[PDB]
RNA sequence: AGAUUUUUGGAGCAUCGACCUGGUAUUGCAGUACCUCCAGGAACGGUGC
């Protein structure tokens, strides 16, 4: 099984390793033994479906600060912290007209997401590890 | 440029005209002689021509050495521990040095096997009774400044400085 | 070849080295004399035609003058002795 | 069988070759030929009533060697 | 010099770096016995260096008690600091950054990937302290001791198994006399066993163990360490019994027991100390002796092949194509080209275009064979 | 093997059978343990024959020396090729 | 960078012998027309100067070698080995805590990327 | 790879080199054993028996 000897379009034999031609069949088998041929041979989804959704009534309290909202949530008995994320109003269930604002929504596993609309462009940061906190001893969530 | 083992390993070691192993180290201008123990006692003569050695000291223990060439240098002081390092020293070439006082040749009498000495072209030889003091210091030296010792010179050396 | 090996085995079994063949048959100790007056007592593990012996657990004794000379001896675990220094080889020693 | 083939198949073994003129060189034998030429590296040689010197390399001939001393951890059945 | 301020802080930083290197060496896993022995030897050398640095740092407290009255004074202060700042106001023309103030002890106490050895321990070797038959603490070499015992006994009726059985005894009857020449071989066997015990555990305190062995030999072995129920009290030096403790206490200060015999407490005390050290080394390293006896039995019960297996463990293409011919290109900073066709291919390339864009000439077909800048500028100005 | 040709043209010292040591550049060797030492020097130790006399070694340089294998005992390396 | 390091070491040696927080040998030198940019915390060298001042304060401890001599660290290799083993155990516990924090962060990233972001409720 | 030249073993005396003192002729171009002779002292060293 020689992977270098092939058949051309003229009824001949071609060695692509040394790029040589042979007319008859007796010259292709005699071209493997030699110096040039030897030189060429030597050179070469689960967590989303299991999430319970009962949608309780959340308790959010906003306060205009100057230099922050407090969400009162029940005990979840889990290490998963509720995550906050800022999204646009272009995606909705019924898609209302004149939706050109942004909304910051906080979501948890046993509870429903609470969303607050922000008419301003940039007045704060919606990052989770930067300016957010979740006290599990009192179960109090804050984001500033 | 200081003297190290790389300057001694790259030097030319061959046979001299006196049928002895000599390593040429001319044209180095080494201010201090150190780390000369890399020869492994396989040389009999060490040349130190055209050097800036201020004091002839820091020599390792070499028993195969029999000739020292310290000509064309600026040696003003001499070391005292030279007899304990070269016990088979016979030839000493200290020509063209900066010796002025007669007390500099007092460790030079420590070599008992020394027979050849060369203190020519030095300010110590310009003073009076220099050869007599050199004969009275080291009596084992037979040839001093290409000249043999004399019996009358030995009597004058034994008579003086009594 | 095989005939030369058979001739060498016959010369080792019936020749002068046959007492050395007693050293590899019953594993008996032999006394070999050296050129430096050192007697080696011990069995021979391997031999050849050039009298080169391989001794195991041998004892080499000699006389060294410090007076009267003492019989200072040593014990080697394994040793090899060339046939050039072998002077006399005794099959059965006295003690 | 000759004993030179058993000595030629010895490498990195700390042996002691005692020469004829009161010399004994103990070291790691690195090369052996058919003429019993023992080339060793980092050996210690002691002459007759002399101090044992240390050599980085040595090459003792076959006719100058008188006896050999092998360690106890060396099988003689596989070497013959 | 700040010997109490800078030198003490430097010694504390060196001790902290040595402790961090020891913790990094102890936290890493081991795969071989020789590498573990080398790491233990490097850790013992680092602990000895840290102990020497702590001993040198603890002696710099004589002038500190006199200088603490002037250093803690609030009346002084910035006058000597301004004088030292004026002394440190020399020429800053030595433009050279030195980041090796703290990184150099961190790199000196570390190892490389090719060789797991520290920079002070770069010249250390496990083959210079242990033999090949010992296996870096795996077994003990007893062939020379057996040969010495066979030479001293002057008999060939003692093999290696008999010597291992005679050496396994601790408080039994000896095979030879206590006042014979076997004590000279026993002292050498004890001195070898002490070095084998000190080489098998370099991280252990050898001086504290030697002091504990000396205290056990002085306070316990010299006062009847083997009680009985002549059999009540036995003496190691005099080799004689005793009726009671009062008779042994009266005979301990006797004239034959002090210096009136050939095996008294004056001359044969070193032999008794060597025998006690050999007994302590046999009791502490009995598992290594059992492993060496098992290895000797496995080597004796094997064949020759098993013992041998156990002991072994082109110019024509450059001349035809026009290569290897130096060509200078003055446009791209007088670059070199090793071919006419290669230079023709690199002329219509990105490097020649970036070289020609600095002079302001556009990349066109008229400046393909242009090499000099004075000709290319004239060709650009003519068009 | 070729262990004898590895130390060729180096400053080697060969011990003689009489106790002398010839140090030189062994450039050529043969199968009969011969040596061609260029710029060779032979050193022979002299007996003190007294109680307070020391042991000296007289050394004499000969140049190119052809040492036969019948007198050579052991050869050791002493210095690199200059 | 040797002169700046020497000046920082001199400032750490002169500031460690103070009897108050603001009454030091470096606060009065700032008003004496001496430029010292390493005293301000806005520079990157202030974090190294604070560590040098902490090392100079730790070098004046009563077990640091001024009025007492350490015996466990200087005359007991077993205590140093036990301290190295305790440091290795503390490093292993810190690595296990970092792995647990990384696993908790991965679980929070898996829970945040699987929640429904379309159930918007404004109260 | 074992039979005389290399590798399976012959294991106080005589001579030479110096050291120290005086007279004596050669002043000369070459790759060298050696290198004028006489007289006096030596408490110098190597080799073989």
UniProtKB/Swiss-Prot annotation, chain B:
Quaternary state and partners of this protein?
Answer: Identified in the spliceosome B complex. Identified in the spliceosome C complex. Found in a pre-mRNA splicing complex with SFRS4, SFRS5, SNRNP70, SNRPA1, SRRM1 and SRRM2. Found in a pre-mRNA exonic splicing enhancer (ESE) complex with SNRNP70, SNRPA1, SRRM1 and TRA2B. Contributes to the binding of stem loop IV of U2 snRNA with SNRPB2.
Q: What does the UniProt record report as the effect of altering residue 67 to K in this chain?
A: No change in spliceosome assembly
- Name of the protein this chain belongs to: U2 small nuclear ribonucleoprotein A'
The highest taxon in the source lineage is Eukaryota
Give the LRR repeat ranges: 19-40, 42-63, 64-85, 88-109
Family classification: Belongs to the U2 small nuclear ribonucleoprotein A family.
* Organism the protein comes from: Homo sapiens
* Function field: Involved in pre-mRNA splicing as component of the spliceosome. Associated with sn-RNP U2, where it contributes to the binding of stem loop IV of U2 snRNA.
Which residue ranges does UniProt annotate as crossing the membrane?
A: none
GO CC annotations?
catalytic step 2 spliceosome; nuclear body; nuclear speck; nucleoplasm; nucleus; small nuclear ribonucleoprotein complex; spliceosomal complex; U2 snRNP
> One of this protein's GO BP terms?
spermatogenesis
- Which residues of the parent chain are present? 2 to 163 of 255
From Swiss-Prot, chain D:
Q: Name one GO biological process term.
A: 7-methylguanosine cap hypermethylation
Q: Which UniProt keywords apply?
A: Cytoplasm, Isopeptide bond, Methylation, mRNA processing, mRNA splicing, Nucleus, Repeat, Ribonucleoprotein, Spliceosome, Ubl conjugation
Q: What is the effect of changing residue 60 to R?
A: Loss of interaction with CLNS1A
One GO MF annotation is:
RNA binding
Q: Where in the cell is it found?
A: Cytoplasm, Cytosol; Nucleus
Q: Using the UniProt record, give the first listed, main subcellular location.
A: cytoplasm
- Region annotated Sufficient for interaction with CLNS1A, chain positions: 1-80
Q: How is it modified after translation?
A: Methylated on arginine residues by PRMT5 and PRMT7; probable asymmetric dimethylation which is required for assembly and biogenesis of snRNPs.
Q: Name one GO cellular component term.
A: U2-type spliceosomal complex
Q: Which domain of life is it from?
A: Eukaryota
Q: Which residues form the Sm domain?
A: 2-74
The family classification in the record reads: Belongs to the snRNP core protein family.
What does this protein do, in the record's words? Plays a role in pre-mRNA splicing as a core component of the spliceosomal U1, U2, U4 and U5 small nuclear ribonucleoproteins (snRNPs), the building blocks of the spliceosome. Component of both the pre-catalytic spliceosome B complex and activated spliceosome C complexes. As a component of the minor spliceosome, involved in the splicing of U12-type introns in pre-mRNAs. May act as a charged protein scaffold to promote snRNP assembly or strengthen snRNP-snRNP interactions through non-specific electrostatic contacts with RNA.
- What is the additional note? In the autoimmune disease systemic lupus erythematosus, antinuclear antibodies are developed with Sm specificity.
Name of this chain's protein: Small nuclear ribonucleoprotein Sm D1
Q: Which organism is it from?
A: Homo sapiens (Human)
Task: State the covered range within the intact protein.
Answer: 1 to 80 of 119
From Swiss-Prot, chain F:
**What are the GO MF terms of this UniProt record?**
histone pre-mRNA DCP binding; RNA binding; snRNP binding; telomerase RNA binding; U1 snRNP binding; U2 snRNP binding
Q: How is it modified after translation?
A: Methylated by PRMT5.
The listed locations are: Cytoplasm, Cytosol; Nucleus
| Sm domain ranges (all copies) | 1-81
Keyword Ligase recorded: no
Keywords on record:
Cytoplasm, Disease variant, Intellectual disability, Methylation, mRNA processing, mRNA splicing, Nucleus, Repeat, Ribonucleoprotein, RNA-binding, Spliceosome
Q: Which domain of life is it from?
A: Eukaryota
What cellular component terms from Gene Ontology apply here?
A: catalytic step 2 spliceosome; cytoplasm; cytosol; histone pre-mRNA 3'end processing complex; methylosome; nucleoplasm; nucleus; small nuclear ribonucleoprotein complex
> Which clinical disorder is mentioned?
Cerebrocostomandibular syndrome: A syndrome characterized by severe micrognathia, rib defects ranging from a few dorsal rib segments to complete absence of ossification, and intellectual disability.
- Role played: Plays a role in pre-mRNA splicing as a core component of the spliceosomal U1, U2, U4 and U5 small nuclear ribonucleoproteins (snRNPs), the building blocks of the spliceosome. Component of both the pre-catalytic spliceosome B complex and activated spliceosome C complexes. As a component of the minor spliceosome, involved in the splicing of U12-type introns in pre-mRNAs. As part of the U7 snRNP it is involved in histone pre-mRNA 3'-end processing.
Q: Which family does it belong to?
A: Belongs to the snRNP SmB/SmN family.
> Under which name does UniProt file this protein?
Small nuclear ribonucleoprotein-associated proteins B and B'
Swiss-Prot record, chain G:
Expression by tissue: Ubiquitously expressed.
Q: Indicate where this protein resides in the cell.
A: Nucleus; Nucleus speckle
Which residues are listed under the site Critical for binding to SF3A3? 10
The segments carrying the SURP motif repeats are 7-49
Subunit composition? Component of the 17S U2 SnRNP complex, a ribonucleoprotein complex that contains small nuclear RNA (snRNA) U2 and a number of specific proteins. Part of the SF3A subcomplex of the 17S U2 SnRNP complex which is composed of three subunits; SF3A3/SAP61, SF3A2/SAP62 and SF3A1/SAP114. SF3A associates with the splicing factor SF3B and a 12S RNA unit to form the mature 17S U2 small nuclear ribonucleoprotein complex (17S U2 snRNP). SF3A1 functions as a scaffold that interacts directly with both SF3A2 and SF3A3. Identified in the spliceosome 'E' complex, a precursor of the spliceosome 'A' complex.
Domain remarks: SURP motif 2 mediates direct binding to SF3A3.
Function noted in UniProt = Component of the 17S U2 SnRNP complex of the spliceosome, a large ribonucleoprotein complex that removes introns from transcribed pre-mRNAs. The 17S U2 SnRNP complex (1) directly participates in early spliceosome assembly and (2) mediates recognition of the intron branch site during pre-mRNA splicing by promoting the selection of the pre-mRNA branch-site adenosine, the nucleophile for the first step of splicing.
Any idea what this protein is called?
A: Splicing factor 3A subunit 1
This protein's species is Homo sapiens
Q: Which gene encodes it?
A: SF3A1
The full protein's residues present here are: 160 to 282 of 793
